[PDB]
Design a protein around this ligand. Structure first.
Ligand SMILES: NC(=O)c1ccc[n+]([C@@H]2O[C@H](COP(=O)([O-])OP(=O)(O)OC[C@H]3O[C@@H](n4cnc5c(N)ncnc54)[C@H](O)[C@@H]3O)[C@@H](O)[C@H]2O)c1
Ligand SMILES: NC(=O)c1ccc[n+]([C@@H]2O[C@H](COP(=O)([O-])OP(=O)(O)OC[C@H]3O[C@@H](n4cnc5c(N)ncnc54)[C@H](O)[C@@H]3O)[C@@H](O)[C@H]2O)c1
Ligand SMILES: [Cl-]
Ligand SMILES: [Cl-]
Ligand SMILES: [Cl-]
Lengths: 328, 328
């Protein structure tokens, strides 16, 4: 019963592989780069037919978390090659090899949570992505649905919440949470994204010392979104892998409730000591609630990493980091 | 107002092109082979980025009919490359070029009509394709829907009925109508597919001379399906190109009612003189009605080619071939 995990060197993938191996289960990784764990893994690409064949031999179940997420147009062809065509051929290879279950990591971008038609967003919400990435995940879901209806291989679609390791939340250098909660990282981010008007706007709000940012829309409505701990995502993925009721299912996977930035930022500020700069962005901004009621009542999923628990652990890590910079 | 028509060397595409040029409109073809009309056309592939950019230059509207339809596993990669990736890059090229309207040829296999969940099949029927070709067209519609919601380009999705030139209906050597209505081209077909238990069964039913076949299901339910004249499809396509109310629309495009083979076959044999063999295939067979009410009500579509009109022309053509052949 070997389990194949693609994206096994990534945030969610590596934690899934570690949980499985801690259970003593046989796992094979599949990622562009080594995990650094020395465990069995393919180093290679989802675009490579040879790698796909090597990866699937003797495999009983597949956790397909490997995907490319990019903003720039120059990366769009690659994103479709990896996310759509890579997923298509991985499905066909899995099916032909007699894989028993295939779990697919999708995204809230298939709805999209950035522009919902109603709240809370349920699995029955229309799938109308507005980003090329979200489009790739929708096409991916459609490939999965085809195998679901047509073969012996069981499938599960899991639409991921935005996911962070707790320690990422209070790290200015983290890819997502830095720009999300800290003003200067966001300036650098937007500069690199080439969003000139935004980067100079943010610049205009800098107060002479590092600060947090409380993001709001043009009407002063604070951003609101789900941020789920990697450990809760791992728990849901293992449920999708093992629970009998997950077969043929599609589930939102994430924490119960979103974080409202008007309540989150002062909690973050209380742990960092940094002041808060409030910025009203042009547009309607971000504001969503996503229901995980289906996965809770079907698979018995229970998220346990509340923002408070996550923040408590993020803060401890930040303080240990400082004490090295500080040498205190 | 240059109109690009992909698949312009094909059954529907060449007829659409001929109609547009008969109206004195400016058209550019795009297909793997020359049409043989001597009109302006790209001879090239949808897989070729260079062909795409050449084809799209100065184009104000695109009628995207070019696609690869195959059953064989060896052809599957190219069918996805042409139908999905070709469509993705054509849409992007068209949007970037300022194309005003993009019309996409989809298929009743997106439902699929070969396995409906309710009759008559309407545009709101769920999209659950069970063939890889059907899946390519569904992925194709999702690409189009992405552009519809996004940019300035108008889109129209047309789900095509099975479509024939009238003259193909009584031609043993036509790709679809030969095997549909003639026993021996069908044996020859089912063999080449590789369905021995089907071919063997048909070969056991040969009465010693060429014959028509009347296909029925296991309970003796004769097949029933829409078969639309290319000319009716062309009329629908021109409406989708021109009618203001087509923008953002999705329409079933086909004749009003399906043909019941128990009625159709005697009419066919009354024109050919050949006997009929009634064959009961294993399975639920083919049985569907598809509604064209939306396109009739919304765009004013009226189909004009009844089966009897189609057959009269098919029979005339058959007699002309037989006459040249036997030199009479
Ligand atoms: N991180 C999030 O908040 C989030 C949100 C929505 C969806 N998702 C999806 O959940 C999955 C896992 O997310 P993550 O947080 O661990 O992101 P991640 O970037 O940390 O991990 C993705 C991994 O996939 C690998 N990969 C990329 N291209 C590959 C290729 N051609 N062949 C083999 N491997 C390749 C990457 O190397 C990477 O290790 C992804 O599919 C992601 O798109 C994540
Ligand atoms: N004929 C039917 O009953 C039917 C039913 C459902 C859907 N459709 C669809 O309606 C459209 C028109 O079909 P048709 O009846 O004219 O069939 P057709 O086979 O006669 O025409 C298809 C044309 O697309 C062209 N094509 C294939 N690959 C190409 C490529 N890589 N680059 C450029 N051109 C390429 C082909 O050369 C061909 O001429 C097609 O999209 C088809 O898939 C047809
Ligand atoms: Cl944000
Ligand atoms: Cl190319
Ligand atoms: Cl048939």
């Amino acid at each position: 019963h070997m389990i194949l995990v693609t994206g096994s060197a990534g945030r969610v993938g590596r934690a899934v592989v570690a949980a499985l191996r801690t259970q003593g289960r046989t796992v094979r990784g599949f990622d562009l780069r080594p995990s650094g764990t020395g465990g069995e893994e393919v180093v290679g690409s989802l675009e490579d037919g040879q790698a796909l064949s090597d990866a699937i031999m003797g495999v009983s179940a597949v956790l397909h978390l490997g995907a490319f997420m990019s903003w720039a147009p120059a990366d769009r062809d690659r994103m479709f090659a990896v996310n759509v065509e890579g997923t298509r051929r991985l499905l066909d290879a899995a099916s032909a090899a007699g894989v028993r279950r295939f779990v697919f990591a999708s995204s809230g971008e298939v709805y999209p949570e950035n522009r919902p038609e109603f709240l809370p967003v349920t699995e029955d919400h229309p799938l109308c992505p507005n980003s090329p990435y979200g489009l790739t995940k929708l096409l991916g879901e459609e490939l999965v649905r085809f195998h679901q209806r047509s073969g012996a291989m069981e499938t599960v679609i899991l639409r991921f919440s935005h996911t962070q390791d707790a320690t990422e939340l209070l790290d200015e250098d983290s890819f997502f949470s830095g720009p999300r909660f800290f003003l200067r990282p966001r300036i650098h981010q937007q500069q690199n994204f080439g969003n000139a008007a935004i980067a100079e706007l943010l610049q205009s709000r800098d107060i002479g010392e590092p600060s947090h940012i409380l993001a709001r829309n043009e009407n002063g409505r604070p951003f609101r979104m789900h941020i789920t701990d990697t450990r809760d995502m791992v728990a849901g993925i293992l449920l999708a892998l093992d629970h009998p009721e997950a077969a043929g299912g599609t589930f939102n996977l994430g924490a119960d409730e979103p974080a409202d930035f008007a309540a989150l930022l002062p909690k973050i500020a209380a742990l960092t000591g940094l002041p808060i700069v409030t910025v009203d962005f042009p547009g309607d901004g971000v504001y969503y609630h996503t229901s995980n009621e289906r996965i809770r009542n079907t698979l018995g999923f229970e998220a346990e990493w509340t923002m408070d628990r996550m923040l408590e652990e993020a803060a401890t890590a930040r303080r240990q980091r400082l004490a090295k910079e500080q040498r205190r």
